[PDB]
């Protein structure tokens, strides 16, 4: 995932 | 790790370079990292309101406004760039004092130890400020590279200085071909280098 | 009450693997990554990678994109990272980490599990005399003691079985070439008390069950 948190991905 | 030293109630700036959103932690040692800033400038739970993040373009600072002892730790940055977490190379404050002559001591082999082939030769620098001291062994007046080790303490949590250690090791045979035995300190706070000797066996 | 508890240290030898685990508490699992950070003795906070423990997807950072295993038990809420192939350069402090309620930062912090990889063998130490000098007075003498070739980390050393605390520096413990640790611990004391005053310090290395006391006095 290319994002800094979980709830992005 | 940077070294920054910091006279109590003065001001530091701690600038991060990157290229959204900087996160900064304080660590001591012997603990986990604390949260400290988050969203570039807003601070922590629990954090003192003399501490203030900012950024602008790629330069991003963390500011501790009228320094306390405790803050007195390292810091890091932390960001989010492509597919990773960067945290940056830490900066470690101390505290800055007055400066402090280091108190010179020289120590002997023992001759329990010299029963088995090795002679550690060891020299003391003794509560001392600023950090940065140079220790030099002489063996009858041959200045000595190579052999050496040594270790430092954190700085003392009341009178903020440091101590050193210097271990010249030897074998035995070496250490019963000479006379003299001397670490030679130069300090900041001594004027002239500091000598401490023996002579062998004395 | 959210709470990152991780398993003991380890010590290794280079080849080995070793597989650390971070058990979660206080918070629903599988509502957020659990993340590794290596820091290295000494040195920086280093980001690894981290674990999705709803899907049990896993990222690596670049640097770490090889001989790490980032894994998660749902059923336990454990979190684990496996090492392998172990090198000494792994010697390191190793970190979970969970990111703020409300922001990305990473607010909770496991405490760390220390793994030592090194060829060297258990192994206590010797303990010698720093004997005060005979030139002592000024009014101020140093003592100490030498504590020489042990391993692994770490050793205690008191004076006067505790009594004595005053004026003590021990000092960290250097890594030989040989890849036993040294380390002195000295105190400062009246030039007075030297021909009256018993000075002792209590070495103890628990790893090879070794306990010294060691007097030191005016050599004569």
């Known amino acids: 995932c290319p994002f800094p948190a979980l709830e992005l991905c | 790790p940077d070294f920054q030293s910091v006279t109590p109630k003065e001001k530091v700036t701690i600038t991060c370079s990157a290229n959204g959103y900087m996160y900064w932690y304080q660590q001591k040692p012997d603990q986990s990292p604390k949260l400290w800033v988050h969203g570039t400038s807003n601070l922590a739970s629990g954090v003192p309101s003399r501490f203030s993040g900012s950024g602008s373009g790629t330069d991003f600072t963390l500011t501790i406004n009228s320094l306390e002892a405790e803050d007195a730790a390292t810091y890091y940055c932390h960001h989010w760039s492509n597919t990773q977490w960067t945290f940056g190379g830490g900066t470690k404050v101390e505290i800055k004092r007055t400066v402090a002559a280091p108190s010179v001591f020289i120590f002997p082999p023992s001759d329990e130890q010299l029963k088995s082939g090795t002679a550690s030769v060891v020299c003391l620098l003794n509560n001392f400020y600023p950090r940065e001291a140079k220790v030099q062994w002489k063996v009858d007046n041959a200045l000595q590279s190579g052999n050496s080790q040594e270790s430092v303490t954190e700085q003392d949590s009341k009178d903020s200085t440091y101590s050193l250690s210097s271990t010249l090791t030897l074998s035995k045979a070496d250490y019963e071909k000479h006379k003299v035995y001397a670490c030679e300190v130069t300090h900041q706070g001594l004027s002239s280098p500091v000598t401490k000797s023996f002579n062998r066996g004395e | 009450q959210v709470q990152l508890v991780q398993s003991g240290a380890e010590v290794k030898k280079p080849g080995s693997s070793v597989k650390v685990s971070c058990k979660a508490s206080?918070?629903?699992?599988?509502?957020?990554?659990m993340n590794w950070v290596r820091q290295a003795p000494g040195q920086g906070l280093e980001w690894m990678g981290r674990?999705?423990?709803?899907?049990?997807?896993?990222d690596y950072a670049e640097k770490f994109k090889k001989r790490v295993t980032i894994t998660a038990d749902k059923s336990t809420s454990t979190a684990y990272m496996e090492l392998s192939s172990l090198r000494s350069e792994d010697t390191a402090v190793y970190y979970c980490?969970?990111?703020?309620?409300?922001?990305?930062?990473?607010?909770?912090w496991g405490q760390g599990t220390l793994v030592t990889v090194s060829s060297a063998s258990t192994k206590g130490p010797s303990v010698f005399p720093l004997a005060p000098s005979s030139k002592s007075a000024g009014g101020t003498a140093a003592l100490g003691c030498l504590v020489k070739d042990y391993f692994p980390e770490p050793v205690t050393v008191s004076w006067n079985s505790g009594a004595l605390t005053s004026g003590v520096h021990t000092f960290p413990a250097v890594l030989q070439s040989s890849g036993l640790y040294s380390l002195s611990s000295v105190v400062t004391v009246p030039s007075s008390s030297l021909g009256t005053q018993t000075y002792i310090c209590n070495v103890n290395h628990k790893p090879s069950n070794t306990k010294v006391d060691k007097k030191v006095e005016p050599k004569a």
């Open positions: 980490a969970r990111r703020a309620m409300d922001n990305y930062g990473f607010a909770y």
């Open positions: 206080g918070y629903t699992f599988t509502n957020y990554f």
């Open positions: 674990v999705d423990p709803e899907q049990g997807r896993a």
